[PDB]
From TrEMBL, chain A:
<dbReference type="InterPro" id="IPR036121">
    <property type="entry name" value="ATPase_F1/V1/A1_a/bsu_N_sf"/>
</dbReference>
<comment type="similarity">
    <text>Belongs to the ATPase alpha/beta chains family.</text>
</comment>
<keyword id="KW-0999">Mitochondrion inner membrane</keyword>
<feature type="binding site">
    <location>
        <position position="379"/>
    </location>
    <ligand>
        <name>ATP</name>
    </ligand>
</feature>
<keyword id="KW-0813">Transport</keyword>
<feature type="binding site">
    <location>
        <position position="192"/>
    </location>
    <ligand>
        <name>ATP</name>
    </ligand>
</feature>
<dbReference type="InterPro" id="IPR038376">
    <property type="entry name" value="ATP_synth_asu_C_sf"/>
</dbReference>
<keyword id="KW-0472">Membrane</keyword>
<feature type="binding site">
    <location>
        <position position="447"/>
    </location>
    <ligand>
        <name>ATP</name>
    </ligand>
</feature>
From TrEMBL, chain B:
<keyword id="KW-0067">ATP-binding</keyword>
<dbReference type="GO" id="GO:0045259">
    <property type="term" value="C:proton-transporting ATP synthase complex"/>
</dbReference>
<comment type="subunit">
    <text>F-type ATPases have 2 components, CF(1) - the catalytic core - and CF(0) - the membrane proton channel. CF(1) has five subunits: alpha(3), beta(3), gamma(1), delta(1), epsilon(1). CF(0) has three main subunits: a, b and c.</text>
</comment>
<feature type="binding site">
    <location>
        <position position="356"/>
    </location>
    <ligand>
        <name>ATP 3</name>
    </ligand>
</feature>
<feature type="binding site">
    <location>
        <position position="159"/>
    </location>
    <ligand>
        <name>ADP</name>
    </ligand>
</feature>
<keyword id="KW-0547">Nucleotide-binding</keyword>
<dbReference type="GO" id="GO:0005524">
    <property type="term" value="F:ATP binding"/>
</dbReference>
<feature type="binding site">
    <location>
        <position position="187"/>
    </location>
    <ligand>
        <name>Mg(2+) 2</name>
    </ligand>
</feature>
<feature type="binding site">
    <location>
        <position position="158"/>
    </location>
    <ligand>
        <name>ADP</name>
    </ligand>
</feature>
Length: 523, 542
């Protein structure tokens, strides 16, 4: 039955036409009596063959591009994943209960788009860019592809500028540069969102103090979250004024798994508007561990072979091609940047899980948030021994770099001395200096929620702690000693430290002088 | 023009099927796709059976239509090789991605070849001094051999592989090839820029005085490009070995990503998956690549490869298969890194074939085996030391725990590439200073010193330099009250005079967001294409 024997059936070999001529005069009368039972034929449109599991099989669509938006006649979007010889498998961006077998699939003629621009700033959109805040359509905006390739080696430069989080433990010990991706990884309920929210609130405080080219425009992508959590978060950004600079992309827990899978690419494309036009972006992918679970659902429903923890083989490429778009661009490309904060939830502190170790291999540092430090009230529960930022170090505040080298070191000894003897075997006077200074600096670094600190008030507060000026207070009123420090010093000393960037020797002993005339609550 | 020009029949992610009306291309042939936005080459992987080939895209396939013309180039992917490729960055298909003009080439070699034959192998073992204590002592590297650095996502195998570029690759005197396979693009920019300021890469008219050529297939690439960029990094290294006849250093960052990219592809080639979820052909896919990276009788390739281990699992079949392909395996552990020991080398899991008394000498060999013996007997004690403590040990065993805590710290050292984030300057330790230093701690000559004097120091001269400082500090700690430079009149102005020296900057108030922007007028209706390709609103039914 080879094709050598089948392509002989191209040329006619009947030599007897007594049935060709007969039915050629009865076929068109036969088809004409069955026309209200024919659906109209389909070549460049599509018709749905099978729908189920959130994947439609579409007959027709002769000229769909691979991976483009198709539109069902229900109004639902899809994306032509695999073009096959006979059908097209599309993944439905929405509920598949409204797609039937026999429905028309229309072609939009464009690979998957989101509206990007200045007019997407302020808005709450879904995983596809359609706004859900109810205040109209997006205007002053244009469409861009959600699967752009990341800039290459020659389109980048080194990470030089600091992105100030406003979180005290972060901007001192794990400092974030401005084109750098940084993983926020921890267990459930450990302050992972609170570090990312405090970064977004803090950029609002700094955009009214920087000359328009150093303004950070944040983007928050919420994948798999509760819709009440997203609505409580939009209200917090609206009441702090942070929605003027924030895009809120939301694919919640009830949304379709292709919408949750697409929402971090949709939000990265909206934030890449600011990277590509010389501005600076801040993208937060809250639970990128929830986006891999949504993509695992689509890959198993497409009957692709599962690997470790039943994740597909390309779940690394899911996240790596996403986080590679967070770059600092070179000066011929505008000098813009995009810094990412993926969030990974961890089960029982196990950092050696599959998706956790994938994103550690992609991102530049981590912010580990320990459950045990979070239960002791040390919030943000930053695991100092494990949290890294090597691209953002030597890109941080020069004043903070002076005082945090001693802070990282006195915490490095504090973990090492507490490793030896926490129970009272014998206490040296030299090591009880370390436990007295270590518990001083730990209470120093813990700060409360939704009030990020400027970097000049943050340098002074650690200057007052790595040096003397706080050894009088035991451990308890150090939180109250900080506003005793930062309110009682002359507020000009924050202006010189901000404008120079570092602690000059003129300001050094001026600030020793102001820290001796502050009145400390532990007396 | 009609035959030997096939058309795209089906697209499933990275895998394209092309149907050729006659004269199918050979397997491993390169196929160009006409009318794509970027240059899309496809490497033929399978003949499917009905005049269809199954091929792997070396770029993205978003945009492919099921009729698109595909021309066959009649040959595999052929990349520029030679001395003209030095100092350039190439991608998987040999295109320059450094904006330095076209790569002038001595030859254009295909990236697919067989291993050198068994008669072509060279069996010679001379040591490669790396300046790293735990490497040069316990698992010493062979000068023409295969070296693997095994790691688990953040344990330090990129810092170690940049340190070997710093230590070995400047005193080597030959050409280097850095094949970056599926790693960070930020790290590709860092190495490229730091090689320009090191003079390893020279730009402009002095390009021929470069010593390194870079091939990059980093982790933003589609899985076809990451599955073949190790092969075009070897082809550049194999030209210097075969034709130029000299000694090459091949540094492959994450040869695991070659195995992982073939595993993303293999699901879509219609294969039954093997164990954990990998390709059925894992050992022969990796074997066919690794057997090309050898020292032959005409030239040498000293190959250092980073090997990622997934979920810290060394029994995962992609790390487990690589172990047989290497002369020296440097296994980096996560628990060693959490004790602050850097490089986080497991001393009882790293192995060389050079640890042989007829190769490195009996004085070197007995120190390495004695260092491993006390570290192993200490590991046998750690179950009791956790529960009962050190108070329940024999004092014969306390001398083990005291010595093995000391050499565990002494195996760590600062790196000259880690000084930019640790602050500590890096120490190259010679082999003779490594052997004598660990021999002193084994015989007992340094039981005086505390265990933190051994931490992050170069050689045994410097633990005595650091122990003296530790003793001295415990005495002198304070008495810096005044008569230093902090006088309020000598070196220091008024505080309010410093406010006026601030250059006040102007703030523009308007955010600059609509200066160049052009807004597409998005319609109130979903715009679609009807049966004739016309931009039509979405019709009203379901
Ligand atoms: N710095 C802080 N100080 C005091 N309380 C905090 C701080 N950070 C978080 N909390 C509280 O602890 C809880 C942690 O919430 P958050 O949403 O930040 O954690 P999460 O890790 O994102 O949790 P989930 O995984 O459930 O989203 C919240 O109820 C928050 O109000
Ligand atoms: N030799 C070292 N000295 C100091 N720190 C190190 C060393 N090796 C690794 N680290 C720390 O661990 C991190 C591991 O980074 P990298 O070497 O890029 O890991 P990977 O093995 O995943 O490539 C580094 O950013 C650094 O902070
Ligand atoms: Mg949260
Ligand atoms: Mg690495």
């Amino acid at each position: 039955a080879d094709a050598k024997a089948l392509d002989e059936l191209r040329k006619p070999k009947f030599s007897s036409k007594y049935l060709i001529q007969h039915v050629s005069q009865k076929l068109i009368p036969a088809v004409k009596e069955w026309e209200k039972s024919y659906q109209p034929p389909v070549i460049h449109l599509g018709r749905v063959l099978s729908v189920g599991d959130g994947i439609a099989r579409v007959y027709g669509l002769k000229s769909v591009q691979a991976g483009e938006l198709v539109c069902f006649d229900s109004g639902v979007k899809g994306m032509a994943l695999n073009l096959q010889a006979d059908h097209v498998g599309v993944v439905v961006f929405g509920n598949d209960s409204v797609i039937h077998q026999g429905d028309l699939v229309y072609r939009t003629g464009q690979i998957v788009n989101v509206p990007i621009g200045p007019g997407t700033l302020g808005r709450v959109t879904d995983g596809l860019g359609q706004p859900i805040d109810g205040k109209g359509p997006l205007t002053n905006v244009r469409s861009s592809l959600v699967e752009v390739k990341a800039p290459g080696i020659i389109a980048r430069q080194s990470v030089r500028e600091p992105l100030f989080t406003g979180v005290k433990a972060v901007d001192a010990l794990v400092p974030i540069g401005r084109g750098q991706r940084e993983l926020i990884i921890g267990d459930r309920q450990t302050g992972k969102t609170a570090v990312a929210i405090d970064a977004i609130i803090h950029q609002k405080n700094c955009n009214e103090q920087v000359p328009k080219a150093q303004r950070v425009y944040c983007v928050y992508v919420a994948v798999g979250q509760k819709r009440s959590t997203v609505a409580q978060l939009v209200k917090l950004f609206t009441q702090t004024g942070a929605m003027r600079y924030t895009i809120m992309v939301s694919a919640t827990a009830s949304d379709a798994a292709p919408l949750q899978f697409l929402a971090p690419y949709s939000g990265c494309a909206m934030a890449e508007y600011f990277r590509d036009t010389g501005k600076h972006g801040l993208i937060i992918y809250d639970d990128l561990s929830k986006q891999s679970v949504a993509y695992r659902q689509m890959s198993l429903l497409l009957r692709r072979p599962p690997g470790r923890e039943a994740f597909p083989g390309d779940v690394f490429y899911l996240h790596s091609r996403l986080l590679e778009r967070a770059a600092k661009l070179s000066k011929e490309l505008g000098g813009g940047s995009l810094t990412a904060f993926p969030v990974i939830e961890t089960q029982a502190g196990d950092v050696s899980a599959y998706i956790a170790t994938n994103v550690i291999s992609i991102t530049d540092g981590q912010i580990f948030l320990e459950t045990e430090l979070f239960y002791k009230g040390i919030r943000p529960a930053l695991n100092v021994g494990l949290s890294v930022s090597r691209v953002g170090s030597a890109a941080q505040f020069p004043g903070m770099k002076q005082v945090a080298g001693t802070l990282k070191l006195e915490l490095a000894q504090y973990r090492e001395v507490a490793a030896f003897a926490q129970f009272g075997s014998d206490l040296d006077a030299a090591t009880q200096y370390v436990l007295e200074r270590g518990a001083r600096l730990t209470e120093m670094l813990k700060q409360k929620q939704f009030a990020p600190i400027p970097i000049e008030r943050q340098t002074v507060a650690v200057y007052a702690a790595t040096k003397g000026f706080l050894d009088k207070v035991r451990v308890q009123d150090i939180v109250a000693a900080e506003e005793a420090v930062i309110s009682q010093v002359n507020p000009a000393v924050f202006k010189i430290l901000k404008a120079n960037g570092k602690i000059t020797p003129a300001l050094d002993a001026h600030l020793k002088a102001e820290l001796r005339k502050v009145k400390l609550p532990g007396a | 023009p009609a035959i030997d020009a096939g058309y795209v029949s089906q697209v499933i992610g990275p895998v394209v099927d092309v149907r050729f009306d006659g004269e199918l291309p050979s397997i491993l042939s390169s196929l160009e796709v006409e009318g794509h936005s970027v240059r899309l080459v496809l490497e033929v992987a399978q003949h499917m059976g009905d005049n269809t080939v199954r091929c792997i895209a070396m770029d993205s396939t978003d945009g492919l239509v099921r009729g698109q013309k595909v021309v066959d180039t009649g040959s595999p992917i052929k990349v520029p090789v030679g001395r003209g490729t030095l100092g350039r960055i190439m991608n998987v298909i040999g295109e320059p991605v450094d904006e330095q003009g076209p790569i002038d080439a001595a030859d254009i070699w295909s990236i697919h070849r067989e291993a050198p034959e068994f008669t072509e192998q060279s069996t010679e073992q001379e040591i490669l001094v790396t300046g790293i204590k735990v490497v040069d002592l316990l698992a010493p590297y062979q000068r023409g051999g295969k070296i693997g650095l095994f790691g688990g996502a953040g344990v330090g195998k990129t810092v170690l592989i940049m340190e070997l570029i710093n230590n070995v690759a400047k005193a080597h005197g030959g050409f280097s090839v850095f094949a970056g396979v599926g790693e960070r693009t930020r790290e590709g920019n860092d190495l490229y820029r730091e090689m320009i300021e090191s003079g390893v890469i020279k730009l402009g008219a002095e390009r021929g005085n470069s010593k390194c050529t870079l091939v990059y297939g980093q982790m933003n690439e589609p899985p076809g490009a990451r599955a073949r960029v190790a092969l075009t990094g070897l082809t550049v290294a194999e030209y210097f070995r075969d034709i130029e006849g000299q000694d090459v250093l091949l540094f492959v960052d994450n040869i695991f990503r070659f195995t992982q990219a073939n595993s993303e592809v293999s699901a879509l080639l219609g294969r039954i998956p093997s164990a954990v979820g990998y390709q059925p052909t894992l050992a022969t896919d990796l074997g066919g690549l690794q057997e090309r990276i050898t020292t032959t009788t005409k030239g040498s390739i000293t190959s250092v490869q980073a090997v990622y281990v997934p979920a810290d699992d060394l029994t995962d079949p992609a790390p487990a298969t690589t172990f047989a392909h290497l002369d020296a395996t440097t296994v980096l552990s996560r628990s060693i890194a959490e004790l602050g020991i850097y490089p986080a080398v497991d001393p009882l899991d790293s192995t060389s074939r050079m640890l042989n008394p007829n190769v490195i000498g009996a004085e070197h060999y007995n120190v390495a085996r004695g260092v491993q013996k006390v570290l192993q007997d200490y590991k046998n004690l750690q179950d009791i030391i956790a529960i009962l403590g050190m108070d329940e040990l024999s004092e014969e065993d306390k001398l083990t725990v005291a010595r093995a805590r000391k050499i565990q710290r002494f195996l760590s050292q600062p790196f000259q590439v880690a000084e930019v984030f640790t602050g500590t300057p890096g120490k190259y330790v010679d082999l003779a200073d490594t052997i004598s230093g660990f021999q002193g701690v084994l015989t007992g000559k340094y039981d005086d010193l505390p265990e933190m004097a051994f931490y992050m120091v170069g050689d045994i001269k410097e633990v005595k330099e650091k122990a003296d400082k530790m003793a001295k500090d415990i005495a002198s700690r304070k008495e810096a009250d005044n008569k230093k430079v902090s006088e309020e009149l000598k070196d220091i102005p008024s505080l309010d005079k410093l406010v006026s020296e601030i250059k006040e900057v102007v703030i523009e108030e308007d955010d600059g967001l609509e200066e160049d922007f052009k807004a597409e007028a998005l319609s109130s209706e979903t715009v679609v294409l009807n049966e004739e390709g016309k931009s039509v609103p979405l019709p009203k039914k379901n």
